[PDB]
Automatic annotation (TrEMBL), chain B:
Protein name (Swiss-Prot/TrEMBL): Na+/H+ antiporter, putative
Domain called Cation/H+ exchanger transmembrane: residue spans: 13-415
Keyword annotations: Antiport, Cell membrane, Ion transport, Membrane, Transmembrane, Transmembrane helix, Transport
Alphabetical list of Pfam families matching this protein: Na_H_Exchanger (PF00999)
The keyword Protease appears for this protein: no
Segments traversing the membrane: 6-24, 31-49, 61-82, 89-110, 116-138, 159-178, 198-218, 225-246, 252-271, 292-311, 317-340, 352-372, 392-412
Superkingdom as given in the UniProt entry: Archaea
BP terms from Gene Ontology: proton transmembrane transport
GO molecular function: antiporter activity
Membrane topology label: Multi-pass membrane protein
Length: 419, 420
């Protein structure tokens, strides 16, 4: 605890996270458990970074980090690969996501003895997936591309869709956090109906404003000539955060807005420019630079998120509920997940569907949403969501992230040969 | 009291700053008064960004910003051009800087009926130079590459040294700031000898540590194979701040350590000859990626610094002493700089000397250290430095920056066509 409380803590997270990243690449082991372990070392163990600083930093890193993460994830998306295998993807992010959210919710409620709403909070938090761990092994194991594309795309589209479900599941238990459209719509049309209508509204408006601001920004780049350093990176950053803030100002998921914007800018090629060659080549250069910068920021954000999650956990609650946590984990990675991917069996084989379903692990987004109910319960004390359930949900999320990551990372060589 | 949301405030500053940057590039107007006027619009006038909130943000933006900016700036230094023009820039960064701070401080002391310490604080603040607002007009008029090299390098070295001089002046006013060594010497030798010996200590230790960390980092990159995304950027950032914190824990200028580190990293080919071609390729790849990211961050930090400076100022005190601040500013531009640059004509002609001694403006660093004594006054209670004197210092720094940038960027063609 000799270090500076604020600055040197941040720098400690950065430094140790970087070293952890290096040794992760060198070892070949996943970056998730390495980062979590690092946080565990500098956090709970060595007591260098107490939970207070962890929360305070995580309150900013949540917003900035998640926004930039979803933006860069939007960038690394090719719409053609999506269109080639659309139906098997679009439905699972529309239905399968909510389905596994409900099954995880129930299977959480029946073991931790709570409300279906809190269980649904856990499920919504843990909704998004992260297959970035599997990719380094996929490329060297030469697994089929047709599944990699649909899994990665699935993650790209479910990441912001897990935040909105978390945002609404929270808004139910705490009255203050929800406001504007949700309050009135829910007050006039009940919880369920008003919630579904609010969901559709949020998604539709987010996609609309996303495409709008994406194309508008893309045209603004040409109209005023933004190709050179440092205007492109700065303007793109400001664009993403513009989408987020005015997307949230009219009460809608600005995260999904930023994601869709990243999709638009990421696929400028298909925007029908009818423009000259010079402009498009130099614009390709500019977009590449911007992608580099923002992806660096997203890397730093990823590291910070995982390390903070590792340094914000308390081993007391976790060890107190380890068996239950593992039970929930295996409950959502073996039971909830395949039964939520049933419609995928329509266009896919038995073993293929089994693979795709069973495979998906949880990562960045659930890690960044884990401490949210806790941190919110501490500030806005509600009898439905207290500190106890905050610790419970968070611990369960961390447990499931770790478990899913390690287990699903380790069981692919044999499963490849079996199929 | 804080009104607008923090995240929305930060975003507002970023957005308006970017738009202002575009407008500044297209119009040809220097980005300094554009940013300052932008912040001025969103700051005092509209009260979108509360002055207290501006303070709280600035306290972070200066620490992160100055470090990343100086570290990046260190890469833009050529050791060959440094060796070819050593005594000149050495005379500039040492003698010229200190003398400038002293005489400008004397002017401020005379005008505002100040003490010697407050004046020296002002001079130390406006000691640094930022010729980045002159580069376009330099490479458009095809001015001599020599004087451009000299000016730019002088900026590179005198930017952190200006913070040290400010650190000195700050430590002499508030009891808490002066840490470790400086205190000992100060209570043993006195403020003069203590300040000088601590200056030498800070400079030497920061430079040596910067070289050590630069070489160590280079060897680590070369060894472990830190060549590709995203290892190089993250690691270089971690190193850039490692130098800062380590340097600050040794009671030295961490900014100077980061700067020297950037100097070492920028000149990677020089550290080892005979090294394989492929190695130089990969190393240049990594270095270019790093430079891209960190320079982008430095640009954002510059935007934030200038805009925040614009949003922080209060027009009351400024307009109350506009003539005084302008008088001090003209005293710095006309008297201070050339009088401190007089021994430079031992290697250059009178015209070249005059150009050099009339071009150097005040930009980023003095703009980030503008409200530092004011902030400290609001933080700690000292019988020497008060609040309103911090207001005076800040406002005078603002006027100085604006006038220096505007005028010394404006008179470039008239001055050049007469001199060279
Ligand atoms: C003005 C000097 C600051 C550096 C400007 C670099 C402009 C080009 O930026 C380039 O972006 C590329 C995107 O892939 C990176 O791979 C390169 O490393 C980077 O140099
Ligand atoms: C309060 C102590 C509770 C102990 C629970 C430990 C769970 C370990 C499960 C191992 C499968
Ligand atoms: Tl994802
Ligand atoms: Tl400079």
């Amino acid at each position: 605890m000799i270090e500076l409380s604020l600055a040197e803590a941040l720098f400690l997270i950065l430094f140790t996270g970087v070293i952890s990243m290096l040794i992760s690449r060198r070892t070949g082991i996943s970056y998730v458990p390495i980062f979590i372990l690092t946080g565990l070392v500098i956090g709970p163990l060595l007591k260098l970074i107490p939970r207070d600083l962890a929360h305070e930093i995580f309150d900013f890193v949540r917003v900035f980090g998640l926004v930039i993460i979803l933006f860069t994830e939007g960038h690394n998306l090719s719409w053609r690969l999506l269109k080639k295998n659309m139906p098997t993807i679009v439905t699972l992010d529309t239905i399968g996501l909510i389905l596994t959210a409900l099954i995880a919710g129930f299977i959480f409620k029946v073991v931790f003895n709570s409300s279906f709403l809190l269980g649904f909070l856990f499920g919504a938090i843990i909704g998004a997936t992260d297959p970035a761990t599997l990719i380094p092994l996929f490329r060297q194991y030469r697994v089929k591309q047709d599944i990699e594309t649909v899994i990665v795309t699935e993650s790209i589209f479910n990441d912001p869709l897990g935040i909105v479900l978390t945002l609404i599941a929270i808004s139910m238990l705490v009255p203050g956090y929800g406001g504007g459209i949700f309050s009135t719509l829910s007050e006039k049309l009940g919880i369920y109906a008003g919630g579904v209508i609010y969901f559709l509204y949020n998604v539709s408006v987010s996609i609309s404003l996303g495409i709008f601001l994406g194309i508008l920004g893309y045209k603004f780049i040409k109209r005023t000539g933004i190709f050179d350093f440092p205007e492109i990176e700065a303007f793109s950053l400001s664009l993403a955060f513009l989408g987020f803030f005015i997307g949230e100002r009219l009460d809608a998921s600005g995260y999904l807005v930023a994601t869709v914007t990243g999709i638009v800018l990421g696929n400028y090629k298909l925007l029908k420019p009818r423009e000259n060659i010079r402009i498009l080549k130099r614009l390709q250069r500019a977009i590449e630079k911007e992608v580099h910068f923002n992806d660096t920021l997203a890397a730093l954000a990823t590291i910070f998120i995982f390390v903070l999650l590792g340094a914000e956990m308390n081993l007391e609650v976790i060890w107190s509920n380890l068996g239950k946590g593992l039970l929930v984990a295996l409950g959502v990675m073996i039971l909830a997940r395949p039964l939520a991917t049933l419609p995928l069996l329509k266009w896919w084989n038995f073993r293929e569907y089994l693979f795709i379903a069973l495979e998906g692990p949880r990562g960045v987004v659930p890690s960044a949403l884990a401490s949210l109910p806790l941190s919110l319960a501490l500030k806005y004390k509600s009898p439905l969501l207290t500190v106890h359930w905050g610790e419970i949900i968070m611990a369960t999320v961390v447990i499931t992230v770790l478990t899913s990551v390690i287990v699903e990372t380790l069981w692919i060589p044999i499963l490849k040969d079996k199929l």
